[PDB]
Ligand binder design. Structure first.
Ligand code: JE6
Ligand code: JE6
Ligand code: HFG
Ligand code: HFG
Lengths: 480, 484
């Protein structure tokens, strides 16, 4: 049972939702959490979608070591260092991977020798470790987390940039098509991009209850800098030695946290049908032996028919729990549809179906069950996305001048503002907004992204902070 | 680009050449760790899909537990890797990288299990583990870091747990025999060889004829209640008394790829069974550089589309800057089970030439006949690969009566099946005796013979049969040999 209200104390609500639904368990090492099966099911679904999609692009999976030698990593950072095997010291300490550039690119330098070898497109599913001192949040910001990382090498910059954009569109689909979470595609600012690359692109999500943006996934154009550092070169069709043009990209189980925060309500989780391991739960109403074998035989009959429409169905015929307990259990876990079958329903040839997202109840004849449920699930998925998109739209304010910023931040909104893109000004804006928030008593505003979808920039439009010529419309807000 | 070491002359150099020249592995500067390149990883993906699909029907659910365990939870030093520092700062308590996840999972089991309604609890996880041994590593077979799955279940009764132990072991038999076409023997480990944390260890064992060695392929343990005692994993039963759960654990690793490589490979390189080959059919246009007109590649595309609508895994090697013969050798070293050749004559006849990797036999096939024919050939290659390997397994096991038969059989690079009293002291004695006799032989890996398993499939034990070593009453036929 969830008792905290989402719109009152959001942090207590989130903790309740993910504990009481059995998504997470705590662990004695700070910043690490156990991912229980109810959460892991969702990860498996988005992993299958993304993996299928990158394979059609020619990306192949691989597995590189979890350890990197001190002198290879440092070609200290907040990495976990292994210094001993048993009681014996290693002659050189080794780190646990925070990301695998230093592990993979020496191999790329060995494998790439001619244009015949390109493009090289690899991905791996693994976990990484970033041992930060700060407060962790389950799914969103943890010390160890699951994440794929893709790394590619190309003969030209244009082919690399094309892949960057293709991958970022896959991340838009991971969020919007699977998880029903709306995201904004954009470029990172110069101060916010990956330092080892040329251009970083991102999908950004918005959490209306605390007003914060959160980076959902990222796709980098690395250019040739790592090719220089690692000596990744190839002979072109005319004999000349050239540097490769690289990309890298990743997305994590943070996606699940964003889903939970987007669609959850006062009763617990709400799982979008496309990633629900159980789409429909059938609950036999058993009491005083009122037509028991009748009811359970019928439930089995219904499961088989729905499955023949590829609906993912679970009968909760466990005998150790009451029907009321089952209603609340599957509601807190977010199953899209609950189908109730009792003696009355069997006498009438119908089932009672309740939608998780809106609570609406439907009396459906057995014959109609499969097509109707399909309609409902399409309806649920679509409505989850559309409601979320409306909230995203209501949470962004277009502004012209800096004087509008603090009122907007106080409404827990993001701002879209014309910006000159000077890196000094982003540093100044972060400092000023933090100071102002402090005085009104994590308050800094930073750039979230420069969106791909740019409204026109009228000639003569001035930067909202510096008064210099504005270049592009930029999304700002408080953030994770 | 070609394998030159012969499998039956210098097996270790053959194995290294096969897995490097096929682009399955890459070396790494940290000893005992290797990079798993896509040609190998695809196979792992296929066996992972099979096993995952099968355990899900048993109600096992996947999960993910942390890779780290606190010093005081692991030591509830071992050969584990210890993290002692974040950046330059010491941890107040060092933490180990998981060598297996019992000490990470079972405290959560103790929290989750309170009543009989909570059972059975059935979890699995796919992850990597680390065992920092100082012995020489072998790619795929024995490494410091390896991918695996490990499953862990808890039950209200011993009979239910034992049923699951046996169901999982049958899945491991199918992983090897049905996916990888490797024959394995199901058996029970001896008291000295079982997992000390458990009551009974079952195994599937494989055999490598070229070096005469047995190798453990996968394992499934009946843990009993010992871990339930240690972690206080108890439940209130249907009548209200606290009871210990009965547990199982089981695991299988990428060692299964190394066993497959050693079982089917030949002097030309790898041979990949069709059921796990990421490319089942490579189409090689007989086309030379700057000669592409569109005729050959156009038909190659039409053929690939047709074959794919039969769910055949097809690749066209249309790479412009390699000759067709180079391509033939490339994909032979990689073990692609079927090569489809398409050149000018094939176009002029409406046929294609298909060559199977395992035997080299060639077939002329009409375009229209390709899809069913290739399906048939692949079923034939899989079956044949398995049936030849099973024959070698059978030729490699000698049934014996007395200890004096043992050294001759080991010198033929064979395993022995022998009646055994099952006394643990005698297995220690046999290991030492065979090691010393091997040493003396070698003057004029170790030579010790150990138990591999006590097979499930037991021939009758005639009344009065004596143990081949102690002369005491024999209990069960036991499989022994030199081992990994
Ligand atoms: C679960 C998760 C996710 C992510 N990040 C990063 C950006 C990214 C995106 N987009 C990655 C590129 C894919 C993402 O998801 C990052 C993290 N931990 C951390 O920062 C370390 C940490 C540990 C304890 C407290 C505070 C911080 N934890
Ligand atoms: C690749 C792989 C596999 C396996 N093992 C174990 C038994 C088992 C079986 N069956 C596991 C239960 C599943 C298996 O496969 C074990 C290993 N490394 C090691 O012993 C550590 C090591 C490191 C360097 C040199 C020598 C030894 N490396
Ligand atoms: O991890 C990255 C860059 C990219 N790597 C490939 C997957 C997508 C990802 O955005 C940035 N990054 C982030 N955090 C890090 C923390 C440490 Br500790 C180190 Cl050494 C290095 C890094 C580091 O390189
Ligand atoms: O890892 C095991 C027992 C079982 N765990 C679950 C998967 C199947 C597997 O056989 C035995 N084992 C093997 N090697 C180990 C190495 C170290 Br180091 C430690 Cl601490 C512990 C162990 C250890 O417990």
């Amino acid at each position: 049972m969830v008792t905290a209200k989402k719109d009152e104390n959001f942090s207590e609500w989130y903790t309740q939702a993910i504990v009481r639904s059995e998504m997470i368990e705590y662990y004695d090492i700070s910043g690490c959490y156990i991912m229980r099966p109810w959460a892991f099911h969702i990860w498996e679904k988005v992993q299958r979608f993304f993996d299928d999609e990158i394979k059609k692009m020619g990306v192949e999976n691989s597995y590189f070591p979890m350890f990197v030698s001190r002198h290879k990593l440092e070609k200290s950072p907040e990495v976990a260092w292994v210094t001993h095997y048993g009681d014996s010291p290693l002659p050189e300490k080794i780190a646990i991977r925070p990301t695998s550039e230093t592990i993979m690119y020496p191999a790329y330098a060995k494998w790439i020798r001619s244009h015949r070898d390109l493009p090289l497109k690899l991905n791996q599913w693994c976990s990484v470790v970033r041992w930060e001192f700060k407060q962790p949040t389950p799914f969103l910001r943890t010390r160890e987390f699951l994440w794929q990382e893709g790394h590619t090498a190309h003969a030209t910059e244009e082919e690399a940039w094309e892949l960057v954009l293709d991958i970022l569109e896959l991340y838009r689909r991971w969020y919007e098509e699977c998880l029903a979470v709306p995201v904004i595609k954009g470029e990172k600012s110069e101060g916010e991009k990956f330092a080892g690359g040329k251009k970083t692109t991102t999908v950004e999500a918005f959490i209306p209850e605390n007003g914060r943006g959160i980076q959902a996934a990222t796709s980098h154009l690395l250019g040739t800098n790592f090719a220089k550092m690692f000596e990744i070169e190839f002979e072109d069709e005319e004999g000349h030695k050239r540097l490769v043009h690289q990309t890298s990209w990743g997305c994590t189980t943070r996606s699940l946290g964003v889903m939970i925060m987007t669609h959850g309500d006062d009763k617990g989780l709400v799982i979008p049908p496309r990633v629900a391991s159980v789409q429909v739960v059938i609950i036999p109403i058993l009491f005083k032996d009122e037509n028991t074998g009748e009811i359970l035989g019928k439930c089995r009959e219904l499961k088989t028919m729905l499955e023949k429409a590829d609906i993912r169905v679970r009968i909760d015929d466990r005998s150790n729990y009451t029907p009321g307990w089952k209603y609340n259990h599957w509601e807190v876990k977010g199953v899209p549809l609950r189908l109730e079958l009792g003696p009355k329903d069997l006498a009438k040839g119908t089932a009672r179906v309740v939608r998780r997202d809106t609570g609406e109840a439907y009396q459906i004849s057995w014959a109609d069950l499969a097509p109707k449920l399909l309609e409902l699930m399409e309806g649920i998925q679509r409505s989850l996305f559309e409601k979320a998109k409306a909230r995203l739209h209501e949470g962004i304010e277009k502004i012209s001048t800096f004087d509008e910023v603090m009122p907007a931040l106080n409404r827990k909104h993001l701002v879209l503002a014309p910006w000159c893109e000077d890196p000094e000004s982003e540093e100044q804006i972060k400092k000023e907004t933090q100071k102002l928030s402090e005085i009104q008593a994590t308050g800094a505003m930073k750039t979230l992204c420069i969106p791909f979808d740019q409204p026109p920039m009228p000639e003569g439009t001035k930067c909202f902070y510096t008064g210099k010529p504005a270049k592009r419309w930029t999304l700002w807000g408080r953030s994770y």
